[PDB]
Coordinates of C-alpha atoms (C1' of nucleotides) in Angstrom, one line a residue:
Chain A
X1 CA 23.1 -21.5 4.1
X2 CA 23.4 -22.0 7.8
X3 CA 26.1 -19.3 8.2
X4 CA 24.3 -16.5 6.3
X5 CA 21.7 -16.6 9.1
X6 CA 23.7 -17.4 12.2
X7 CA 25.1 -14.0 11.4
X8 CA 21.9 -12.1 12.4
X9 CA 22.7 -10.8 16.0
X10 CA 20.7 -11.6 19.1
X11 CA 17.7 -9.6 20.2
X12 CA 19.4 -9.2 23.6
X13 CA 22.4 -7.8 21.7
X14 CA 20.5 -5.2 19.6
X15 CA 18.4 -4.2 22.7
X16 CA 21.8 -3.2 24.1
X17 CA 22.8 -1.3 20.9
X18 CA 19.9 0.9 21.7
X19 CA 20.3 1.4 25.5
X20 CA 18.5 4.8 25.9
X21 CA 18.3 5.1 22.1
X22 CA 14.6 3.9 22.0
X23 CA 12.2 2.2 24.5
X24 CA 13.2 -1.5 25.1
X25 CA 9.7 -2.6 24.1
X26 CA 9.8 -0.9 20.7
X27 CA 13.3 -2.1 20.0
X28 CA 12.6 -5.8 20.6
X29 CA 9.5 -5.5 18.3
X30 CA 11.5 -4.0 15.5
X31 CA 14.2 -6.6 16.1
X32 CA 11.8 -9.4 15.8
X33 CA 10.1 -8.1 12.7
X34 CA 13.6 -7.4 11.2
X35 CA 15.0 -10.8 12.5
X36 CA 12.2 -12.6 10.6
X37 CA 12.7 -10.6 7.3
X38 CA 16.4 -11.7 7.3
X39 CA 15.7 -15.4 8.1
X40 CA 13.4 -15.7 5.2
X41 CA 15.5 -13.6 2.7
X42 CA 18.6 -15.7 3.4
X43 CA 16.6 -19.0 3.4
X44 CA 15.4 -18.2 -0.2
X45 CA 19.0 -17.1 -0.9
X46 CA 18.3 -13.4 -1.8
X47 CA 20.7 -11.7 0.7
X48 CA 24.4 -12.0 1.0
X49 CA 24.9 -8.8 3.0
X50 CA 23.6 -8.1 6.5
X51 CA 25.0 -4.5 7.0
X52 CA 21.5 -3.2 6.1
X53 CA 20.3 -4.8 9.4
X54 CA 21.4 -2.2 12.0
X55 CA 20.1 0.7 9.8
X56 CA 16.7 -1.1 9.2
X57 CA 16.0 -2.1 12.8
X58 CA 16.2 1.6 13.8
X59 CA 13.8 2.5 10.9
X60 CA 11.2 0.0 12.2
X61 CA 11.6 1.6 15.6
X62 CA 11.1 5.1 14.1
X63 CA 8.0 3.8 12.3
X64 CA 6.5 1.5 14.9
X65 CA 6.3 4.4 17.3
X66 CA 3.7 6.4 15.4
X67 CA -0.1 5.8 15.3
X68 CA -1.4 5.0 11.9
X69 CA -4.4 7.4 11.8
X70 CA -3.1 10.9 11.3
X71 CA -4.4 14.4 10.8
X72 CA -4.1 15.2 7.0
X73 CA -3.8 18.6 5.3
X74 CA -6.6 18.7 2.7
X75 CA -5.7 20.8 -0.3
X76 CA -8.3 19.2 -2.7
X77 CA -10.9 21.9 -2.0
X78 CA -13.6 19.3 -1.3
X79 CA -15.3 20.1 2.0
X80 CA -17.2 16.8 2.4
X81 CA -14.4 14.5 1.5
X82 CA -15.7 11.0 2.2
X83 CA -12.1 9.7 2.1
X84 CA -10.4 12.3 4.4
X85 CA -13.0 12.0 7.2
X86 CA -15.8 14.3 6.2
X87 CA -16.8 17.3 8.3
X88 CA -13.9 18.5 10.6
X89 CA -14.7 19.8 14.1
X90 CA -14.3 23.2 15.7
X91 CA -12.0 23.6 18.7
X92 CA -15.1 24.6 20.8
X93 CA -16.6 21.2 20.2
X94 CA -13.4 19.2 20.6
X95 CA -12.8 20.7 24.1
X96 CA -16.4 20.0 25.2
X97 CA -15.8 16.4 24.1
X98 CA -12.3 16.4 25.8
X99 CA -13.9 17.4 29.1
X100 CA -16.7 14.9 29.2
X101 CA -14.3 12.1 28.3
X102 CA -11.7 13.2 30.9
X103 CA -13.8 11.6 33.6
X104 CA -17.3 10.4 34.6
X105 CA -20.4 12.2 33.3
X106 CA -24.2 12.0 33.6
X107 CA -24.4 10.1 30.2
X108 CA -27.2 7.7 31.2
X109 CA -27.8 9.5 34.5
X110 CA -30.5 12.1 35.2
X111 CA -29.2 14.3 38.0
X112 CA -32.7 15.4 39.0
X113 CA -34.3 12.1 39.9
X114 CA -31.0 10.3 40.8
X115 CA -31.9 7.2 38.7
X116 CA -30.8 6.0 35.3
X117 CA -31.9 8.0 32.3
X118 CA -31.9 7.8 28.5
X119 CA -28.7 9.2 27.0
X120 CA -30.6 10.2 23.9
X121 CA -32.6 12.6 26.1
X122 CA -29.9 15.3 26.3
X123 CA -29.9 16.1 22.6
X124 CA -33.4 15.6 21.3
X125 CA -34.4 18.8 23.0
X126 CA -32.2 20.6 20.5
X127 CA -33.4 18.6 17.4
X128 CA -37.1 19.1 18.0
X129 CA -36.5 22.9 18.3
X130 CA -34.3 23.2 15.2
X131 CA -36.3 21.0 12.9
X132 CA -39.8 21.6 14.1
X133 CA -40.6 17.8 14.3
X134 CA -42.7 16.2 17.0
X135 CA -39.9 14.1 18.5
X136 CA -36.4 12.9 17.4
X137 CA -33.8 10.2 17.9
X138 CA -30.2 9.5 17.0
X139 CA -28.2 6.4 16.1
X140 CA -24.6 5.5 15.0
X141 CA -24.9 6.7 11.4
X142 CA -27.5 7.4 8.7
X143 CA -26.8 4.0 7.2
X144 CA -28.3 2.5 10.3
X145 CA -30.8 5.3 10.6
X146 CA -32.4 3.9 7.4
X147 CA -32.1 0.2 8.4
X148 CA -33.8 1.1 11.7
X149 CA -36.8 2.9 10.3
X150 CA -37.4 0.1 7.7
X151 CA -37.1 -2.8 10.2
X152 CA -39.2 -0.7 12.6
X153 CA -42.1 0.2 10.4
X154 CA -41.8 -2.1 7.3
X155 CA -40.5 -5.4 8.4
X156 CA -42.4 -7.9 6.3
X157 CA -44.5 -5.3 4.5
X158 CA -44.0 -3.3 1.3
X159 CA -42.1 0.0 0.8
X160 CA -42.5 2.0 -2.4
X161 CA -39.5 3.9 -3.8
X162 CA -38.5 5.3 -7.1
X163 CA -36.3 3.2 -9.4
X164 CA -34.0 6.3 -9.8
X165 CA -33.4 6.6 -6.0
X166 CA -31.9 3.2 -5.3
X167 CA -28.4 4.4 -4.5
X168 CA -25.0 3.0 -3.8
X169 CA -23.3 5.5 -1.5
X170 CA -19.9 4.4 -0.1
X171 CA -18.3 1.1 -0.8
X172 CA -20.7 -1.1 1.2
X173 CA -24.0 0.8 1.4
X174 CA -26.8 0.1 -1.2
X175 CA -30.5 0.9 -0.5
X176 CA -31.5 -2.4 -2.2
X177 CA -29.1 -4.6 -0.3
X178 CA -29.6 -3.1 3.1
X179 CA -33.4 -2.8 2.8
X180 CA -33.3 -6.4 2.0
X181 CA -31.5 -7.2 5.3
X182 CA -33.9 -4.7 6.8
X183 CA -36.8 -7.2 6.5
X184 CA -38.8 -4.8 4.4
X185 CA -40.1 -5.8 0.9
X186 CA -38.9 -3.4 -1.8
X187 CA -41.4 -2.0 -4.4
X188 CA -39.6 0.0 -7.0
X189 CA -41.6 2.3 -9.1
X190 CA -41.0 4.5 -12.2
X191 CA -37.9 4.3 -14.3
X192 CA -34.3 5.4 -13.9
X193 CA -34.5 8.9 -15.5
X194 CA -38.2 9.5 -15.0
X195 CA -40.8 8.9 -12.3
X196 CA -44.1 10.6 -12.0
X197 CA -46.5 10.5 -9.1
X198 CA -48.8 8.0 -10.8
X199 CA -46.0 5.5 -10.4
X200 CA -46.0 5.9 -6.6
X201 CA -49.8 5.8 -6.3
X202 CA -50.1 2.8 -8.6
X203 CA -48.1 0.4 -6.5
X204 CA -49.9 1.0 -3.2
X205 CA -51.9 -1.8 -1.6
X206 CA -52.7 -3.7 1.6
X207 CA -49.0 -4.4 2.4
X208 CA -47.7 -0.9 1.6
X209 CA -46.5 0.4 4.9
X210 CA -44.1 3.0 3.7
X211 CA -43.4 5.5 1.0
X212 CA -39.7 6.2 0.9
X213 CA -37.6 8.7 -1.1
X214 CA -33.9 8.8 -1.1
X215 CA -31.9 12.0 -2.1
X216 CA -29.3 11.4 -4.8
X217 CA -26.4 12.8 -2.7
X218 CA -23.5 11.3 -4.5
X219 CA -24.7 11.6 -8.1
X220 CA -27.1 13.3 -10.4
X221 CA -28.9 12.9 -13.7
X222 CA -29.3 15.4 -16.5
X223 CA -31.0 15.3 -19.8
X224 CA -34.6 13.9 -20.0
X225 CA -35.4 13.4 -16.3
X226 CA -38.5 13.6 -14.1
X227 CA -38.8 13.5 -10.3
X228 CA -41.7 13.3 -7.8
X229 CA -42.2 16.5 -5.9
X230 CA -42.1 16.3 -2.1
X231 CA -45.4 18.1 -1.6
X232 CA -47.0 15.5 -3.9
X233 CA -45.8 12.5 -2.0
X234 CA -47.0 14.1 1.3
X235 CA -50.4 14.6 -0.3
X236 CA -50.4 11.0 -1.6
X237 CA -49.6 9.6 1.8
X238 CA -52.3 11.6 3.7
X239 CA -54.8 10.3 1.0
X240 CA -54.2 6.6 1.6
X241 CA -53.0 6.9 5.2
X242 CA -49.4 6.0 4.5
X243 CA -46.3 7.4 6.2
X244 CA -43.6 9.4 4.3
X245 CA -39.9 8.8 5.0
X246 CA -37.2 11.1 3.5
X247 CA -33.6 10.1 3.6
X248 CA -32.0 13.5 3.0
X249 CA -28.5 12.0 3.5
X250 CA -26.8 15.3 3.4
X251 CA -28.3 16.2 6.8
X252 CA -28.7 19.8 6.0
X253 CA -29.9 21.4 9.2
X254 CA -30.8 24.8 7.6
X255 CA -31.8 26.6 4.5
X256 CA -28.7 27.0 2.4
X257 CA -29.7 30.0 0.3
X258 CA -29.4 32.1 3.5
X259 CA -25.6 32.0 3.1
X260 CA -25.3 33.1 -0.5
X261 CA -25.1 29.6 -2.0
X262 CA -28.1 29.0 -4.2
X263 CA -29.1 25.4 -4.3
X264 CA -32.2 23.2 -3.8
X265 CA -30.7 20.9 -1.3
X266 CA -33.4 19.9 1.2
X267 CA -33.1 20.5 5.0
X268 CA -34.9 19.2 8.1
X269 CA -36.9 22.2 9.2
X270 CA -38.3 22.8 5.7
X271 CA -38.8 19.2 4.9
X272 CA -40.6 18.7 8.3
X273 CA -42.8 21.7 7.8
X274 CA -43.7 20.2 4.4
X275 CA -45.7 17.3 5.9
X276 CA -43.2 14.6 5.9
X277 CA -43.6 12.1 8.7
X278 CA -39.9 11.1 9.1
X279 CA -36.6 12.5 8.0
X280 CA -33.0 11.2 8.5
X281 CA -29.4 12.3 7.7
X282 CA -25.8 12.0 8.6
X283 CA -24.3 14.4 11.2
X284 CA -20.9 14.4 9.6
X285 CA -22.0 15.8 6.2
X286 CA -23.9 19.0 5.8
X287 CA -24.5 19.4 9.6
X288 CA -20.8 19.6 10.2
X289 CA -20.9 17.6 13.4
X290 CA -19.6 14.1 14.4
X291 CA -20.8 10.9 12.7
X292 CA -24.5 10.4 13.6
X293 CA -27.7 9.1 12.2
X294 CA -30.4 11.7 12.8
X295 CA -34.1 11.0 12.8
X296 CA -36.9 13.6 13.3
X297 CA -40.6 13.3 12.7
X298 CA -44.0 12.3 14.2
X299 CA -43.8 11.3 17.9
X300 CA -45.9 8.1 17.5
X301 CA -43.2 7.0 15.0
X302 CA -40.2 8.0 17.0
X303 CA -41.5 6.1 19.9
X304 CA -41.9 3.0 17.7
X305 CA -38.4 3.3 16.5
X306 CA -36.9 3.8 20.0
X307 CA -38.6 0.7 21.4
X308 CA -37.1 -1.4 18.7
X309 CA -34.5 -3.8 20.3
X310 CA -32.1 -3.0 17.5
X311 CA -31.8 0.7 18.6
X312 CA -29.5 -0.4 21.4
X313 CA -27.0 -1.8 19.0
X314 CA -27.0 1.6 17.2
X315 CA -27.2 3.9 20.2
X316 CA -24.5 6.5 19.9
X317 CA -21.2 6.6 21.9
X318 CA -20.2 9.1 24.6
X319 CA -17.9 11.0 22.3
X320 CA -20.2 11.7 19.3
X321 CA -23.1 12.4 21.7
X322 CA -21.4 15.2 23.6
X323 CA -19.7 16.5 20.5
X324 CA -23.1 16.6 18.8
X325 CA -24.7 18.6 21.6
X326 CA -22.0 21.4 21.3
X327 CA -22.5 21.3 17.6
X328 CA -26.2 21.8 18.1
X329 CA -25.6 24.5 20.7
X330 CA -23.6 26.4 18.1
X331 CA -26.6 26.2 15.7
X332 CA -29.0 27.8 18.3
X333 CA -26.6 30.6 18.9
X334 CA -26.3 31.3 15.2
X335 CA -22.6 30.9 15.4
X336 CA -22.5 29.5 11.8
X337 CA -18.9 30.5 11.1
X338 CA -17.8 28.3 14.0
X339 CA -18.7 25.1 12.2
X340 CA -15.9 24.3 9.7
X341 CA -18.0 22.9 6.9
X342 CA -20.4 25.9 6.8
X343 CA -17.5 28.4 6.9
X344 CA -15.5 26.6 4.1
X345 CA -18.3 26.8 1.6
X346 CA -19.7 30.3 2.4
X347 CA -16.2 31.8 2.3
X348 CA -15.8 35.1 0.4
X349 CA -14.4 34.7 -3.1
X350 CA -12.2 37.5 -1.9
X351 CA -11.5 35.5 1.2
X352 CA -10.0 32.6 -0.8
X353 CA -7.5 34.7 -2.9
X354 CA -6.4 36.4 0.3
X355 CA -5.2 33.0 1.5
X356 CA -4.1 31.9 -2.0
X357 CA -1.5 34.6 -2.3
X358 CA -0.5 34.5 1.4
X359 CA 0.8 31.0 0.7
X360 CA 2.5 32.0 -2.5
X361 CA 4.4 34.6 -0.5
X362 CA 5.7 31.8 1.7
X363 CA 7.0 29.6 -1.2
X364 CA 8.8 32.1 -3.5
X365 CA 12.1 31.5 -1.7
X366 CA 12.1 27.7 -1.8
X367 CA 14.5 26.4 -4.6
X368 CA 13.2 25.4 -8.0
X369 CA 9.6 26.3 -7.2
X370 CA 7.3 27.6 -10.0
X371 CA 4.5 29.3 -8.1
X372 CA 1.3 30.6 -9.7
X373 CA -2.3 31.4 -8.4
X374 CA -5.2 30.4 -10.7
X375 CA -8.9 31.0 -10.5
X376 CA -10.6 27.6 -11.1
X377 CA -14.2 26.3 -10.8
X378 CA -14.4 23.1 -8.7
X379 CA -17.2 21.0 -7.1
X380 CA -16.9 21.5 -3.3
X381 CA -19.4 18.9 -2.2
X382 CA -18.1 15.3 -2.1
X383 CA -20.7 13.3 -0.3
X384 CA -23.7 15.6 -0.2
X385 CA -23.7 18.2 -3.1
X386 CA -23.0 16.5 -6.4
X387 CA -23.9 19.3 -8.9
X388 CA -22.6 22.3 -7.0
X389 CA -19.7 24.1 -8.7
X390 CA -18.1 27.1 -7.0
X391 CA -15.1 29.3 -7.9
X392 CA -11.9 29.0 -5.7
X393 CA -8.2 30.0 -5.9
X394 CA -5.7 27.3 -6.5
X395 CA -2.0 27.9 -6.0
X396 CA -0.6 25.8 -8.8
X397 CA 3.1 24.7 -8.2
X398 CA 5.8 23.1 -10.3
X399 CA 9.5 22.1 -9.6
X400 CA 12.1 21.6 -12.4
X401 CA 13.7 18.6 -10.8
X402 CA 10.7 16.5 -9.7
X403 CA 7.5 15.7 -11.5
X404 CA 3.9 16.4 -10.4
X405 CA 3.2 12.7 -9.8
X406 CA 6.2 12.0 -7.6
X407 CA 5.4 15.3 -5.8
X408 CA 1.9 14.3 -4.7
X409 CA 3.4 11.0 -3.5
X410 CA 6.0 12.5 -1.1
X411 CA 3.5 15.1 0.2
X412 CA 1.2 12.3 1.3
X413 CA 4.2 10.8 3.2
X414 CA 5.1 14.0 4.9
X415 CA 4.4 14.7 8.6
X416 CA 1.9 16.1 8.5
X417 CA 0.8 14.6 5.2
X418 CA -0.9 16.7 2.5
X419 CA -3.3 15.4 -0.2
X420 CA -3.9 17.4 -3.3
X421 CA -5.4 17.4 -6.8
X422 CA -3.4 16.9 -10.0
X423 CA -4.2 18.4 -13.4
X424 CA -1.9 18.3 -16.4
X425 CA 1.4 17.9 -14.5
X426 CA 0.6 20.9 -12.3
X427 CA 0.0 20.1 -8.6
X428 CA -2.9 22.2 -7.3
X429 CA -3.9 23.5 -3.8
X430 CA -7.5 24.5 -3.3
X431 CA -7.7 27.1 -0.5
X432 CA -11.3 26.4 0.2
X433 CA -10.3 23.6 2.6
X434 CA -7.0 24.9 3.9
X435 CA -6.7 26.2 7.5
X436 CA -4.4 29.1 8.2
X437 CA -2.1 27.3 10.6
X438 CA -1.4 24.9 7.7
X439 CA 0.2 27.6 5.5
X440 CA 3.2 27.6 7.8
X441 CA 3.3 23.8 7.8
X442 CA 3.0 23.7 3.9
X443 CA 6.1 25.8 3.4
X444 CA 8.2 23.9 6.0
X445 CA 7.3 20.5 4.4
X446 CA 8.1 21.7 0.8
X447 CA 11.5 23.1 1.8
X448 CA 12.4 19.8 3.4
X449 CA 11.8 17.8 0.3
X450 CA 13.4 20.0 -2.4
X451 CA 16.5 21.2 -0.4
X452 CA 17.2 17.9 1.3
Chain B
rG1 C1' -7.5 -32.5 49.6
rG2 C1' -9.7 -30.2 44.4
rG3 C1' -8.8 -25.8 40.9
rA4 C1' -6.3 -21.9 39.4
rG5 C1' -2.5 -18.1 39.0
rU6 C1' 2.8 -16.4 39.4
rA7 C1' 7.5 -19.6 38.4
rG8 C1' 12.3 -21.9 37.4
rA9 C1' 19.9 -21.7 36.2
rU10 C1' 24.9 -23.9 35.7
rA11 C1' 27.8 -19.4 42.8
rG12 C1' 23.4 -16.0 45.2
rG13 C1' 18.7 -12.1 44.7
rC14 C1' 16.0 -9.3 40.3
rG15 C1' 14.9 -8.3 35.0
rC16 C1' 15.4 -9.6 29.7
rU17 C1' 16.1 -12.0 25.0
rG18 C1' 14.1 -17.5 19.0
rG19 C1' 21.0 -16.0 17.4
rU20 C1' 23.8 -21.1 20.9
rG21 C1' 22.3 -16.6 26.2
rU22 C1' 22.5 -11.7 28.7
rG23 C1' 22.0 -6.8 31.8
rC24 C1' 21.5 -4.7 36.9
rC25 C1' 22.8 -5.6 42.2
rU26 C1' 25.2 -8.8 45.6
rC27 C1' 28.6 -12.7 47.2
rC28 C1' 33.0 -15.0 46.6
rU29 C1' 37.8 -15.4 44.7
rA30 C1' 41.2 -13.3 41.7
rG31 C1' 43.7 -9.0 39.5
rA32 C1' 44.6 -3.8 38.8
rC33 C1' 45.2 0.5 41.8
rU34 C1' 45.3 3.1 45.9
rU35 C1' 50.8 6.0 51.9
rC36 C1' 46.4 3.1 55.0
rA37 C1' 41.1 2.2 54.1
rA38 C1' 37.5 3.2 51.1
rA39 C1' 36.1 3.7 46.6
rU40 C1' 36.7 1.9 41.6
rC41 C1' 37.3 -1.2 38.0
rU42 C1' 37.8 -6.2 35.6
rA43 C1' 36.4 -12.0 35.1
rC44 C1' 34.3 -17.0 27.1
rG45 C1' 35.5 -17.3 36.7
rG46 C1' 32.3 -19.9 39.9
rU47 C1' 27.4 -24.9 40.8
rC48 C1' 26.8 -29.8 39.9
rU49 C1' 28.8 -33.6 37.5
rC50 C1' 31.2 -36.9 34.9
rG51 C1' 35.1 -38.5 32.3
rC52 C1' 40.4 -38.6 31.2
rU53 C1' 46.1 -38.6 32.9
rA54 C1' 48.6 -39.2 37.8
rU55 C1' 46.2 -41.6 41.4
rU56 C1' 47.0 -41.3 48.7
rU57 C1' 46.3 -36.3 47.7
rA58 C1' 47.9 -32.9 44.9
rA59 C1' 48.1 -31.5 39.9
rG60 C1' 46.5 -30.6 34.5
rC61 C1' 42.6 -31.2 30.9
rG62 C1' 38.2 -32.2 28.3
rA63 C1' 32.5 -32.1 28.2
rG64 C1' 27.0 -31.6 29.6
rA65 C1' 22.9 -30.0 32.5
rG66 C1' 18.2 -24.3 32.7
rG67 C1' 12.8 -28.5 37.7
rU68 C1' 12.0 -33.6 34.4
rG69 C1' 10.7 -35.5 29.8
rG70 C1' 9.0 -34.5 24.9
rG71 C1' 8.3 -31.2 20.5
rU72 C1' 8.9 -27.1 16.8
rU73 C1' 13.0 -25.2 14.7
rC74 C1' 19.0 -24.1 10.9
rG75 C1' 19.4 -22.8 16.3
rA76 C1' 14.9 -23.2 22.5
rU77 C1' 17.4 -20.0 28.3
rU78 C1' 13.1 -17.9 25.4
rC79 C1' 7.9 -20.9 22.4
rC80 C1' 4.1 -25.6 23.0
rC81 C1' 2.9 -29.9 25.7
rA82 C1' 3.0 -33.5 29.9
rC83 C1' 4.5 -34.4 35.0
rA84 C1' 6.9 -32.7 39.2
rU85 C1' 8.1 -28.8 42.7
rA86 C1' 7.9 -23.5 45.1
rC87 C1' 5.2 -19.3 46.3
rU88 C1' 0.0 -17.4 46.4
rC89 C1' -5.3 -17.1 45.7
rC90 C1' -10.7 -19.9 45.8
rC91 C1' -13.5 -23.7 47.2
rG92 C1' -14.8 -29.0 50.8
Chain C
rG1 C1' 0.1 8.5 -14.3
rG2 C1' -4.7 5.3 -16.1
rG3 C1' -8.4 4.7 -20.4
rA4 C1' -9.5 5.1 -25.1
rG5 C1' -9.1 6.4 -30.3
rU6 C1' -5.4 6.8 -34.8
rA7 C1' -0.9 3.6 -36.4
rG8 C1' 3.3 1.0 -38.7
rA9 C1' 7.5 -1.5 -45.4
rU10 C1' 11.7 -3.8 -48.0
rA11 C1' 14.5 4.1 -51.4
rG12 C1' 10.8 8.6 -49.6
rG13 C1' 5.0 11.3 -49.2
rC14 C1' -0.5 9.5 -50.0
rG15 C1' -4.2 5.4 -51.3
rC16 C1' -5.5 0.1 -52.0
rU17 C1' -5.6 -5.3 -52.1
rG18 C1' -6.5 -12.9 -48.7
rG19 C1' -3.8 -14.3 -55.0
rU20 C1' 2.6 -14.5 -52.9
rG21 C1' 1.5 -7.4 -53.1
rU22 C1' -0.1 -3.0 -55.9
rG23 C1' -2.0 2.5 -57.9
rC24 C1' -1.2 7.9 -57.7
rC25 C1' 2.9 11.6 -56.5
rU26 C1' 7.9 12.3 -55.4
rC27 C1' 13.1 11.1 -55.1
rC28 C1' 17.1 8.8 -57.2
rU29 C1' 18.5 7.2 -61.7
rA30 C1' 18.3 5.4 -66.3
rG31 C1' 16.7 4.8 -71.2
rA32 C1' 14.0 6.4 -75.5
rC33 C1' 13.0 10.3 -78.6
rU34 C1' 12.6 15.0 -80.8
rU35 C1' 16.5 19.9 -86.5
rC36 C1' 16.3 22.2 -80.6
rA37 C1' 14.0 22.7 -76.7
rA38 C1' 9.9 21.5 -74.2
rA39 C1' 7.0 17.8 -73.4
rU40 C1' 6.4 12.7 -73.3
rC41 C1' 7.2 8.1 -72.4
rU42 C1' 9.2 3.9 -70.0
rA43 C1' 11.4 0.8 -65.4
rC44 C1' 9.4 -8.3 -62.9
rG45 C1' 15.2 -0.9 -60.6
rG46 C1' 16.3 0.7 -55.6
rU47 C1' 17.0 -0.1 -48.0
rC48 C1' 19.2 -2.8 -44.4
rU49 C1' 21.8 -7.0 -42.4
rC50 C1' 23.9 -11.2 -43.2
rG51 C1' 25.5 -14.8 -46.0
rC52 C1' 27.2 -16.6 -50.8
rU53 C1' 29.7 -16.8 -55.7
rA54 C1' 33.4 -14.1 -58.4
rU55 C1' 36.8 -12.3 -55.5
rU56 C1' 41.7 -6.7 -56.5
rU57 C1' 37.3 -4.7 -57.7
rA58 C1' 33.4 -5.3 -60.1
rA59 C1' 29.5 -7.9 -60.6
rG60 C1' 25.6 -11.0 -59.6
rC61 C1' 22.5 -13.6 -56.1
rG62 C1' 20.2 -15.7 -52.1
rA63 C1' 17.7 -14.9 -47.2
rG64 C1' 14.7 -12.2 -43.9
rA65 C1' 13.0 -7.8 -41.8
rG66 C1' 6.2 -4.9 -43.7
rG67 C1' 8.0 -2.6 -35.4
rU68 C1' 8.5 -7.9 -32.5
rG69 C1' 6.3 -12.6 -31.8
rG70 C1' 2.3 -15.8 -32.9
rG71 C1' -2.0 -17.8 -35.4
rU72 C1' -5.6 -18.9 -39.4
rU73 C1' -5.0 -20.3 -44.1
rC74 C1' -3.8 -23.7 -50.2
rG75 C1' -1.6 -18.6 -49.8
rA76 C1' -1.2 -13.0 -44.7
rU77 C1' 1.4 -6.7 -47.0
rU78 C1' -4.1 -7.5 -46.1
rC79 C1' -7.3 -10.8 -41.1
rC80 C1' -6.8 -11.6 -35.7
rC81 C1' -4.1 -11.6 -31.2
rA82 C1' -0.1 -10.3 -27.8
rC83 C1' 3.9 -6.8 -26.6
rA84 C1' 6.3 -2.7 -27.5
rU85 C1' 6.6 2.1 -29.7
rA86 C1' 4.6 7.1 -32.2
rC87 C1' 0.3 10.9 -32.7
rU88 C1' -4.4 12.6 -30.2
rC89 C1' -8.6 12.9 -26.9
rC90 C1' -11.1 11.7 -21.4
rC91 C1' -10.4 10.9 -16.5
rG92 C1' -6.9 11.4 -11.1

RNA sequence: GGGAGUAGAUAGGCGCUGGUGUGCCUCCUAGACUUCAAAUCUACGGUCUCGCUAUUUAAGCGAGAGGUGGGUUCGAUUCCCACAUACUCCCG
RNA sequence: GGGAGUAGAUAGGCGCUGGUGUGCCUCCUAGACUUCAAAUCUACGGUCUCGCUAUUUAAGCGAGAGGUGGGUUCGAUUCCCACAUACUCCCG
């Protein structure tokens, strides 16, 4: 027992084995981790050999020297992929962020008056113009955007909402569970599938401080189903003197039909010009910018929200703020194609095949590869457009040696890693989400796994 | 004087390491080598000590200590704790 | 790959039954009968593995396997459960 462990060398001795091989710091860390795995494996009597030690210690070093979060090549064809980090950023934005983070900036400083200033002041100019709302505000994310409006205007008082709009988006967010913690009392009207206007108007009373509607972003209902029109709820509010609050969620900044895609998804400008008092949404969904809770509406309300002592715990960071301004700057200049998420969904059907076969031309040489391009209909929107179904070209592949399952697995372990769909033992690569500079990296990773 | 930080050798200065210590530089001594010097290289080397044989001394041989003590642990130079000391910083 | 639906013999295909399994069809065979055929009819029949008796062989017989195990029960081929395996459909 006590000889199968004395064996394990000394950390000073393996540090030497890797003089300039690897940084001394990373070597000792790998030696300790490895030194402990052999002390316990020999104590339980499951190891008789120690030759695996030297080879392993170097593997920990090779592993411990790489950050965990890593860029990932998305081949699934889902633009708003909740799991892969939603809306990706254009180089233009990322450099504007790079520069403001490089050194000091006038984040909370107004250069004119030479005294402290509100950091939320830089942006709001853009929002008010783009939406048409009276005033605006921005916080960490939309989850908090909701929580803030409720605790600001309905703490202790009733909020009416349709029983079909109490959603569970994400793993931890649930309108009913957060609104609870929001301090607002929840008044659910109508039924799951159907909800008329009479349901809303019927539950109003002395405590009703808010009429709230949530947009079913991550799901939808078909069959016998009724919903309350937006113009109707504005009318109902202005009748009793109650505010209207729409949680768009998708955070669509513009009309979407303007780009060829025909859908009813709501957007700020239009929802604002409808008579709604407040509107919110995430910046990293249909806006295509960094994570951000966006609120626009009546000035008297925005000012009530801002003054809330909880807004300081949600106030946005220096990175997303800047990055959001450049994203908004692009919107004013109509540079639509510059923002990843808008370009990916409004891409020419022709455009997609053009990239579908430019990849197939790069994989015909690789050994054992069965390459075919198929025209499939998928659902692009992951966290904002549930029903949408648009055509896109998938380059379906298949190797004689390895199986589709094992294939996805190694591809997610590659550097860079690639995540893709699987359908009937045929790995699939949706080109709707693939950047050009990835095509070269796709071919170089597949040739390293099948010819190695 | 009161706190706190940095700390520690078993030739000497610095740095490291849960594997019974070790690497860099220096000193010393020794060896190798070198026309001379230098350079270079090497050392289960060195301190203290104690104990053993002889015992005037010489001479040969064996063992332990890491400021001190304790603890964890298969194993502590490494880690914890307590006290001491050195250097430094703040206060009366 | 994950779910789910269909499932299973003790000659072989289909159907049934809490009564120690059974009906239709086939196979194999066998027997009966008819001037001849043809037809028809009939069968406490049948596998495996092991074991047993006789033991040259025959020949006869016993056990269990109804995928495997378990349970309920007076009795399980039936019912349930678990695992595994075969056919099909939904999802990643």
